[PDB]
């Protein structure tokens, strides 16, 4: 029988996560009220920057619309634009107000927290800068470290038992969990990750969690611990026989608990 | 296990000194009483052994003794043994009279 | 030594009146002969896991079993058990092949 | 024989091991629910990414299918494709599809677990980047630490067992076990590793693993310990005679274990 | 050569302390007998202090 208690953290959902980089180097033009820390939400503008890249493009392609070309010459130069990373937005901004675009607009791709923000006013930009790392944290992450001495039992485990201390009315049962195939090297733990739904924003990244295991496992033979008579390399246990006689015998020891 | 959990012996010694005393907060007055604070702190159960605290990351897992052991009751060092008629070990007691009495 | 391979008391459990010993040791196998001594595991402090063997040797040897002392003299005391005879006869009888023998 | 137990680690395999970076520059299209520490398996999408690296060339190789271009022309165009990077899966299709193509998909190469995920949504990708790291462990590496002073504990004959503190109900088989040729100068012992079935993948990277050993010294004269006597200048045992006379005879002690 | 070494007197008497002792480590049943481990330690030599 057990009854433990996992150290448990919470983190930001990782398959909500975004890095902003501009499609061509180019200058900020200016930068929004925003800082690592902020939360930000999909739509909301990182900041203005110039890009020369496709200019020469985009001349072709006005050049081409003066001159009734192709079809087809359209399409192409309008291709070789999209292929050169102009956002398809942008290219929209272009055929709709026939003038060069130079002056674009990065915004927030989700809902998130701004994790990273390297890019301020008076600033060159370039194609490996991050102008924005932002995190989503609604579906919130947990993840538990168990000790590994027992994954032979939390492989088949029903349910835990979350609860933060920051939030006692957040307490719930976990019936879904991902276990992961790695195990923590510094204190050898198992991963174990679970999603919890955080509308409210009550869960927050860096908060403390607590995951709670109570479980009997399949039924094995029991002994009481004060009877195994265990060297490092020899454990038995002294049975008592019929007439009462002493008789050590061999065993082999699952694990103990309690 | 110590040098799985990267664990040195005096580590664990000195974990179990930390881990085994009750201590005193002097006291608090409420409704003109004595409330007297009081710390708990006593190694009374197995399990209290077993979470005896050695290390901490930064994440907040931390490494029990537990883990580089098991802890278990068993016999102290006999210094003395005690037979009565030959099919038995036993405890016994003796009475010592003062000197002159 | 003391704690390893010894069975040294570290610390007592207060439990009520009463007081019981806390130890530290690792387990028989490690410390069942010389042999196992000279491959006893030692984590040292840089982590390197080296055995015993690696910072001493391990040697048999016979000594003082125990010292007993007469007014600051070393002495050993002969238990001799007669009980046919009487005390004189034997004493005289065993001053004389003392003397000669 | 010699017996011995030394403190093992569970590791990745290392000969299962894939570092996944793009053949050419482009910008991330849309990356798959994935992160660090996750499983899987080969096939599994990573991300989905736009390469304008090798569209000239391909509208150059669609032209040839045109204007009845000669088998060869057609194959040396497809081989400015291949040494360009371009995968031959994606190859296959340009010329299946007869579309050129802009937009592709990055796949797992092998089963395994992610190490490595340094590309988000929003990037741009890079040659050198790695996309994904993934190291596999089906037959999954422990390698054991002896101390140098016992090297001689280990010979070619010796019979090795192995027992993860995880999985007490796992009876594992080794596969095969080397010496490593150097010693970790950080902790001073000799490395072996032994590689072992883990199809059921119950032995997680990370893991605690004890690692026993038999060893067969040269034959000598075998008695139990407790029937020799040492006083540290000299060794006996007590021998029995034919009348069952006990009398004492002067032994040398070769060594002892167990 | 406290400077030159990078060692601090504090360092060297607490090392002191450390290197003149003896230990036991109790005792161990061979043959039915007692085997008293004892572990030297005591410095006794002027090399032993060096």
């Known amino acids: 029988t057990f009854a433990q208690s996992f150290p448990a953290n919470v983190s930001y959902?990782?398959?909500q996560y975004a890095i902003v980089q501009a499609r061509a180097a180019g200058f900020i033009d200016k930068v929004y009220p925003l800082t690592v820390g902020d939360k930000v939400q999909k739509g909301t503008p990182l900041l203005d920057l110039t890009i020369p890249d496709w200019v020469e493009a985009q001349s072709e392609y006005l050049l081409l619309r003066e001159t009734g070309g192709t079809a087809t010459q359209t399409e192409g130069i309008l291709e070789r634009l999209?292929?050169?990373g102009m956002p398809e937005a942008d290219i929209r901004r272009l055929?709709?107000?026939?003038?060069?675009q130079t002056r674009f607009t990065l915004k927030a791709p989700i809902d998130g927290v701004i994790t990273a923000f390297d890019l301020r006013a008076g600033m060159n930009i370039a194609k490996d800068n991050v102008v924005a790392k932002i995190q989503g944290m609604d579906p919130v992450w947990v993840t538990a470290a168990i000790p590994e001495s027992i994954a032979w039992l939390v492989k088949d485990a029903s349910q835990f038992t979350l609860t933060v201390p920051a939030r006692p009315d957040k307490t719930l049962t976990i019936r879904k969990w991902t276990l992961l195939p790695g195990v923590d090297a510094a204190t050898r733990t198992l991963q174990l990750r679970l999603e919890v739904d955080n509308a409210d924003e009550a869960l927050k990244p860096g908060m403390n969690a607590w995951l709670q295991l109570n479980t009997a496992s399949e039924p094995?033979?029991?002994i009481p611990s004060q009877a195994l008579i265990d060297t490092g390399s020899e454990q038995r246990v002294i049975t008592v026989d019929a007439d009462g006689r002493f008789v050590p015998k061999r065993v082999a020891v699952f694990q103990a608990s309690q | 296990?110590?040098?799985?959990?990267?664990?040195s012996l005096a580590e664990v010694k000195s974990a179990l000194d930390a881990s085994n005393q009750e201590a005193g907060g002097s006291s608090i007055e409420l409704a003109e009483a004595e409330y007297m604070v009081r710390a708990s702190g006593y190694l009374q159960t197995l399990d209290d052994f077993n979470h005896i605290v050695l290390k901490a990351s930064e994440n907040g897992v931390p490494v029990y003794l537990?883990?580089?052991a098991k802890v278990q009751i068993g016999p102290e060092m006999r210094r003395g043994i005690a037979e009565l008629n030959g099919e038995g070990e036993v405890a016994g007691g003796v009475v010592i009279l003062r000197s002159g009495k | 030594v003391t704690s390893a391979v010894g069975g040294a008391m570290v610390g007592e459990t207060v439990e009520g009146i009463a007081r019981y010993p806390i130890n530290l040791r690792y387990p028989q196998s490690w410390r069942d002969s010389p042999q196992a001594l000279r491959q006893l595991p030692i984590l040292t402090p840089m982590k390197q896991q080296i055995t015993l063997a690696d910072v001493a040797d391990i040697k048999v040897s016979t000594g003082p079993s125990m010292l007993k002392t007469e007014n600051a003299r070393p002495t050993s005391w002969i238990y001799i058990?007669?009980?046919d005879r009487d005390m004189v006869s034997v004493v005289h009888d065993l001053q004389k092949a003392?003397?000669?023998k």
Do not use: F
């Open chain 2, 1 to 7: 296990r110590l040098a799985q959990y990267g664990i």
């Open chain 3, 81 to 83: 058990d007669a009980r």
């Open chain 1, 82 to 84: 999209r292929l050169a």
């Open chain 3, 98 to 100: 003392i003397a000669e």
């Open chain 1, 13 to 15: 959902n990782e398959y």
């Open chain 1, 95 to 100: 055929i709709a107000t026939q003038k060069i």
């Open chain 1, 220 to 222: 094995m033979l029991l």
């Open chain 2, 66 to 68: 537990r883990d580089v």
